């Protein structure tokens, strides 16, 4: 489908002689042009050879004129690799792949697989497992439990402290995991060089019995029960099958199967091996068959429930009314209105059996060059894959996993072979990683740095970078761009849609998927440590356990004005255009002091409406340029904060001690929504801002990165949007952001940040400060997507935190445990900073300066597009070049457009037929811009086109936009332009509409040929300029630019120009020449001589 070997020499013409790299490019291109569609893998490899031929030529010859054309050809290649893989439509191998590596299949997983088996009976079920990988889960649970006990007894005197960072406990627990895993791998290496070979289960049995107080018969019973369950549920073994062919793949699979216990990466590798050896579809157990689109075609949409939670409602109702999966907890569906439930009842009971309640597609049109992957949060997720036998792109995914594990092993095996403590080996591993650092793979090494910590310490996510979605995204970038072994280069979401799993075939928003989406982060780590210390010794050991009391202390204004404001050291250095309603909701001193300090951060632009006592709330703000506290009514403002554009509500309270807490300040999401509604009604009479922001602050109030709609801030925002957009005008839904801090941080006199712990005072838990400041993002509704996105974090702020970590690690008065905790925190911070660049999560500036730039880019893209389909139209129906298109006259004529082309040598008009309506739209836009330019030129004298200067800005910007558009069209050069000459077409149209009548009325071909010749000859400058570089004075008389016309009239003395200047404009120019003076004097003398005669 690419251009032939010809038409390229006409494109890449250069003064340099044709180089041998250019000859290689031409040979590769022609050898690709002559090829057969069969064996798409080689059809792909020819393109993947031509591409690097072009890349080598460009890199070698940077200052080469050819590099223009070949860059457009590479882009064409980028749009041709998509065409390939769109030819094959063969049905996918009718196999459904499920993976359960290690442990036994849960009955929930089996019930989930039952839907796929029953509904898609055409496909056979493949539940992958291993013969000797059944006790890995037991070993992992045993080691983590023993290490938890060891760490708790090691820090027993410290864990009793309510304000104790659980990261130290996790550090000790990881030291113990690494010790136990080193013991296990030493045992495995010792017992693997034995006569014959023991099964991995045998080594695990021996280790568990000898060290972990286990019984062999229990392990054997578990093994046989798991084997029976898996086999009865369509179990397929891996060891007893040809799946582990390459030794490197076996090494990297056993790298997480037994060295680490990371069965997730084992699944990520065995799924790829299964999809390569055989074909079919892989699905994680959490996924469910899709529903029919038309089954719920009606619109019971509440518009107050998130679009994802709407799918959750659909599935929950489906499996609650007609029970398909056991114990499908309806905690989300069974709270909606009764009419909606009755409608769902009618819909579900009005259908046929299970075969039609859920969709089932056998029309999976994939190619052997392609794999499909599910989508989540606008990124790839390997929860659902489709690929034939030995798919080439799948092979690219295996190659990417192999390269990533090659780097990780190369930098880790030297660190782990030397027998050292966990801290020492991690230090060595990090040193090797960052000594081998490169600009290309800096984020990769940042992500894989806590490889030994994945699954056991919070915020450790390296599987995503080695075998998870990162590897698949890199493989997709390799496939689209024909590259190889790319690490961090990402693919735009527009080009990623072609590989998407069919949306009808997947119900991703599933209860088990949602349950598994909860990442092991600081938020979850807090409650995991709390559970550990609840199971050990006893007692709540909670932060709220410390004298949480319900006193009603009013504001000590003297305390605020004498200790809070004077001692303030936090500098905002931002915008400060906000009114900050510090609505403290709990009367305890823990919230009271946080309230006072947060007031002290910016006392003037902040007001306290403390709600410790119900019917006494009063705005305790600061007097205008004074040292006094002025007390208005509830939620009132000093009336000097009337022009403030932002309302920063900062509800202070204590959230419930539960993961994903449901109640904040003892008020749930609905009660707090009502409170915010009363807030908005009260402030509607005072302030009408533009950006509302809620800043919930308190213990157990994290900013969760996953399952945002299930979070307290997310549900709160989902509640207060109608009230925000109605009560407060000029506040669109996307301007509301809700955050959730956990600690109140101040800067003391020595510059050290301190947190108000629940034990009173201001403790200096530096790791807690920097983790809390790092882990906070603002949930905001996205009206363009009807989803709750997260605002970009303060990247300069995150880098400031990272630099603080750097300098504070440089200090020698810090514990080694704290040293490595802060190193890991810095790693996470820089990984998040890299993620905001890798995931395309940063929005453009979107202002007047950028809009003109962005609109120009969009115009250029549409220009290239239109040139592309006009090249397509000039390829078929012959008509290639030298038949300049006439955009002025395009006729729809009953949904089949008839466009006119004009030959160069003669005025030959052919009204070819096209079906695409894009030509009409582009012609309309071109005519509009040319009309704007023509209206900017009120008159032309002797074809000089006197500009009509407009001093208003609107006309100036309109004229400049039209001039940019037309000049970009006129000066166009491209790979397609040589066979198209779109630039010549637009230049001809502009010359016709300006110098003569419109191109619609120029059917007379004899003068049309002259018009074609003249338009191409001269260059028309349509850009707004008073003087076209001529060093002359400019005479602009009440709008008309006349200086150039007068100068050329007085220099050349064109009689025509004088005539049209006298007539059209009304300009008389005095010729001060001596010759004209002599002629006029002679004229007058002759007239005097002849007139006085009387004959």
């Amino acid at each position: 489908s690419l251009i032939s070997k010809e038409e390229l020499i006409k494109l890449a013409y250069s003064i340099r002689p044709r180089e041998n790299e250019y000859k290689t490019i031409l040979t590769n291109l022609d050898e690709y042009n002559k090829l057969t569609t069969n064996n798409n893998e080689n059809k792909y490899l020819q393109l993947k050879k031509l591409n690097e031929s072009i890349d080598v030529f460009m890199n070698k010859y940077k200052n080469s004129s050819r590099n223009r054309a070949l860059s457009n050809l590479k882009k064409d290649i980028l749009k041709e690799v998509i065409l390939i893989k769109n030819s094959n439509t063969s049905p996918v191998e009718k196999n459904l792949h499920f993976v359960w590596i290690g442990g036994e299949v849960s009955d929930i997983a089996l019930e989930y697989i039952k839907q796929w088996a029953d509904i898609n009976a055409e496909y056979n079920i493949k539940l992958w497992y291993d013969s000797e990988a059944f006790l890995v889960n037991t070993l992992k649970k045993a080691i983590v439990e023993s290490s938890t006990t060891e760490a708790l007894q090691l820090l027993e005197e410290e864990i009793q402290n309510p304000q104790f960072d659980n990261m130290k406990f996790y550090k000790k627990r990881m030291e113990f995991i690494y010790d136990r895993q080193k013991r296990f791998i030493n045992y495995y290496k010792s017992q693997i060089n034995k006569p014959t070979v023991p099964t991995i289960d045998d080594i695990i049995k021996s280790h568990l019995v000898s060290e972990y107080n286990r019984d062999e018969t229990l392990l054997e019973s578990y093994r046989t029960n798991s084997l029976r369950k898996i086999n009865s549920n369509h179990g397929i073994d891996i060891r007893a099958n040809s799946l582990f062919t390459e030794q490197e793949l076996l090494n990297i699979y056993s790298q997480e199967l037994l060295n680490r216990g990371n069965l997730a990466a084992a699944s990520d590798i065995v799924r790829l091996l299964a999809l390569k050896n055989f074909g079919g579809v892989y699905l994680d157990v959490d996924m469910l068959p899709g529903i029919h689109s038309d089954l719920f075609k009606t619109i019971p949409r509440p518009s107050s429930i998130g679009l994802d939670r709407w799918e959750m409602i659909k599935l929950e109702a489906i499996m609650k009314y007609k029970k398909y999966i056991n114990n499908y907890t309806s905690e989300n569906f069974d709270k909606l209105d009764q009419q909606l439930k009755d409608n769902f009842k009618l819909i579900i009971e009005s259908k046929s059996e299970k075969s039609e309640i859920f969709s089932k597609l056998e029309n999976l049109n994939v190619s052997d060059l392609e794999i499909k992957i599910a989508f989540a949060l606008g990124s790839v997720i390997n929860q659902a894959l489709i690929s034939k036998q030995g798919s080439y792109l799948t092979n690219l995914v295996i190659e990417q996993v192999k390269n990533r594990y090659q780097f990780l092993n190369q930098h880790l095996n030297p660190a782990i072979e030397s027998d050292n403590n966990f801290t020492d080996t991690t230090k060595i591993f990090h040193d090797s990683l960052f000594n081998s650092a490169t600009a290309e793979n800096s984020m990769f090494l940042t992500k894989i740095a806590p490889y030994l910590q994945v699954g056991f310490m919070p915020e450790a996510r390296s599987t995503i970078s080695l075998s998870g979605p990162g590897a698949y995204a890199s493989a997709y970038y390799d496939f689209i761009n024909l590259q190889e072994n790319t690490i961090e280069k990402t693919l735009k979401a527009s080009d990623l849609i072609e590989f998407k799993f069919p949306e009808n075939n997947l119900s991703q928003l599933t209860e088990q998927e949602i349950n598994s989406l909860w990442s092991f982060d600081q938020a979850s780590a807090k409650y995991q440590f709390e559970k550990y210390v609840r199971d050990y010794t006893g007692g709540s050991l909670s932060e709220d356990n410390g004298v949480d009391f319900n006193k009603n202390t009013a504001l000590d204004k003297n305390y605020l004005l004498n200790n809070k404001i004077p001692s303030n050291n936090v500098e905002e250095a931002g915008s400060k255009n906000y009114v900050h309603y510090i609505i403290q909701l709990q009367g305890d001193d823990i919230s009271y002091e946080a309230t006072c300090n947060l007031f002290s951060k910016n006392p003037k632009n902040s007001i306290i409406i403390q709600r410790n006592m119900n019917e006494s709330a009063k705005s305790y703000f600061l007097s205008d340029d004074g040292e006094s506290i002025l007390e208005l009514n509830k939620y009132r403002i000093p009336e000097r904060l009337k022009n403030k554009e932002k309302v920063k509500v900062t509800f202070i309270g204590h959230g419930k001690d539960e993961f994903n807490t449901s109640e904040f300040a003892r008020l749930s999401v609905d009660s707090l929504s009502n409170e915010i509604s009363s807030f908005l009604d009260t402030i509607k009479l005072d302030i009408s801002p533009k950006n509302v922001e809620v800043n919930l602050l308190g213990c157990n109030m994290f900013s969760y990165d996953f399952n945002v709609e299930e979070t307290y801030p997310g549900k709160l925002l989902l509640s207060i949007m109608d009230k925000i957009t109605s009560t407060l005008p000029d506040v669109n839904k996307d301007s509301i952001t809700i955050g959730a801090n956990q600690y109140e941080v101040r800067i003391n006199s020595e510059g050290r940040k301190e947190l108000l712990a629940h034990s009173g005072k201001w403790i200096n838990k530096e790791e807690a400060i920097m983790s809390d400041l790092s882990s906070k993002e603002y949930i905001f509704f996205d009206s363009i997507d009807n989803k709750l996105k997260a605002k970009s974090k303060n990247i300069p702020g995150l880098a400031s935190i990272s630099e603080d970590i750097k300098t504070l690690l440089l200090d020698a008065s810090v514990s080694p445990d704290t040293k490595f905790i802060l190193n890991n925190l810095k790693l996470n911070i820089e990984s998040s900073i890299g993620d905001y660049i890798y995931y395309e999560k940063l929005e453009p500036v979107k202002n007047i300066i950028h809009n003109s730039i962005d609109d120009l880019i969009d115009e250029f893209n549409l220009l290239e597009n239109v040139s592309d389909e006009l090249y397509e139209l000039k390829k078929l129906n012959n008509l290639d070049e030298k038949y300049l298109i006439s955009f002025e006259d395009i006729s729809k004529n009953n949904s089949t457009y008839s466009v006119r082309f004009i030959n160069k040598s003669n005025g030959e008009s052919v009204y070819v037929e096209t079906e695409k309506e894009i030509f009409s739209k582009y012609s309309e836009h071109i005519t509009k811009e040319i009309s704007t330019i023509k209206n900017s030129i009120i008159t032309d004298v002797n074809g000089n086109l006197l500009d009509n200067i407009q001093l208003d800005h609107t006309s100036q910007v309109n004229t400049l936009n039209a001039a940019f558009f037309i000049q970009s069209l006129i000066d166009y050069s491209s790979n397609k332009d040589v066979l198209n000459d779109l630039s010549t077409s637009v230049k001809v149209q502009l010359y016709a509409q300006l110098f003569s009548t419109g191109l619609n009325t120029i059917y007379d071909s004899i003068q049309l040929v002259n018009l074609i010749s003249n338009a191409v000859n001269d260059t028309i400058n349509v850009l707004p300029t008073i003087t076209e570089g001529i060093p002359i004075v400019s005479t602009i008389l009440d709008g008309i630019n006349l200086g150039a016309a007068i100068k050329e009239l007085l220099d050349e003395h064109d009689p025509l120009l004088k005539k049209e200047l006298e007539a059209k404009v009304g300009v008389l120019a005095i010729n001060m020449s001596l010759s004209i003076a002599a002629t006029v004097a002679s004229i007058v003398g002759i007239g005097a001589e002849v007139t006085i005669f009387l004959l």
Partner: protein, 346 residues
């Protein structure tokens, strides 16, 4: 010409904000002694709606035009440095778009460098909005000559993201590295060089547009300082001090803003106006440093103006200040001598 335009630029810079109203050109004509063209000194020169002044630079030219509000601003401008063409219009704001010069007859090799300097922005820097560098797909090296301290205003330099075939694009700044801090707003990188050169608080901003959108662009730019070179953007972000770049004065407005307690005016280009400008058939003064309205007595280039405490407009007739009596002409300049107020000739 080059000499007269250089003198005009010196006069504009040496002015105290009186550089954009129509009366400014009358002051310039008095300074250049344009009355000597006719022969007598009592000539009142009329600066009308469509008055145009074209000044030739050693590189190119700049054309200023008068507006409907009797304000003079850059209508057009173009200057070429044999490697980079810089063009300013009025419809795209007052933005200097710097692009690599597209050599005709493309058979010859195409240059990869694209330089920029503050030299051509002398004097007219008070009319410029921003500098938009627009490298093409052939641009590999971008030289930013930041060592020019004889200016007053340093427009933000916006480097547009190039959809280029080059693996790396080099931004070479002719300055040190300890001066620069960095920041981000949206998906744009920001490098701010703040220094004290001859008691001048020079602050130069260089943002790169859309450079944080994807790793294809983040890892493409390489920063080259005078002391340390071949720095990637990640190196800058991990080694250089970071500041907060968002400010209220950088938003987009069309009229009067009351930011904090200071009033600013955003003209048609949604940019702050600076100096003594005509607004709504009234004369206002904005500080040539902070661009905010000032009320009271202002000595602009030696001439005293009074601006109302409430509305900020300039007094243009007999006025009573603190009980005392003052006289101002229609241009707002305080007058000395005997003049007729309502009470009589004072």
């Amino acid at each position: 010409n080059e000499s007269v335009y250089s003198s005009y630029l010196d006069f504009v810079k040496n002015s105290d904000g009186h550089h954009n109203t129509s009366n400014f050109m009358n002051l310039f004509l008095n300074n250049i002694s344009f009355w000597k063209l006719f022969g007598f000194e009592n000539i009142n020169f009329v600066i009308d709606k469509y008055f145009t002044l074209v000044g030739k630079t050693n590189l190119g030219y700049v054309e200023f035009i008068c507006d409907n509000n009797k304000n003079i601003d850059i209508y057009f401008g173009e200057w070429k440095t044999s490697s980079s063409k810089s063009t300013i219009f009025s419809g795209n704001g007052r933005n200097v778009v710097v692009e690599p010069i597209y050599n005709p007859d493309t058979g010859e090799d195409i240059s990869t460098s694209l330089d920029f300097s503050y030299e051509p922005l002398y004097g007219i820097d008070r009319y410029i909005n921003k500098v938009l560098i627009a490298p093409d797909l052939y641009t590999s090296l971008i030289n930013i000559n930041t060592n020019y301290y004889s200016n007053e205003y340093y427009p933000e330099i916006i480097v547009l993201n190039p959809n280029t075939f080059h693996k790396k694009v080099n931004i070479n700044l002719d300055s040190s590295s300890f001066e620069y801090k960095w920041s981000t707003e949206g998906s744009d990188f920001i490098l701010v060089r703040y220094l004290e050169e001859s008691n001048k608080k020079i602050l130069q901003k260089i943002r790169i547009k859309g450079i944080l959108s994807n790793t294809q662009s983040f890892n493409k730019m390489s920063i080259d300082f005078k002391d340390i070179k071949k720095l990637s953007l990640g190196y800058i972000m991990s080694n250089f001090k970071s500041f907060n770049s968002e400010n209220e004065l950088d938003r987009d407005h069309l009229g009067f803003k009351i930011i904090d307690n200071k009033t600013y005016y955003y003209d048609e280009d949604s940019k702050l106006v600076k100096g003594l400008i005509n607004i709504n058939n009234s004369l206002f003064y904005f500080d040539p440093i902070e661009s905010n309205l000032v009320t009271g007595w202002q000595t602009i280039n030696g001439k005293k103006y009074y601006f109302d405490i409430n509305t900020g407009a300039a007094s243009t007739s007999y006025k009573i200040i603190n009980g005392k009596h003052f006289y101002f002409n229609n241009n707002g300049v305080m007058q000395l001598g005997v003049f007729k107020g309502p009470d009589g000739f004072e």
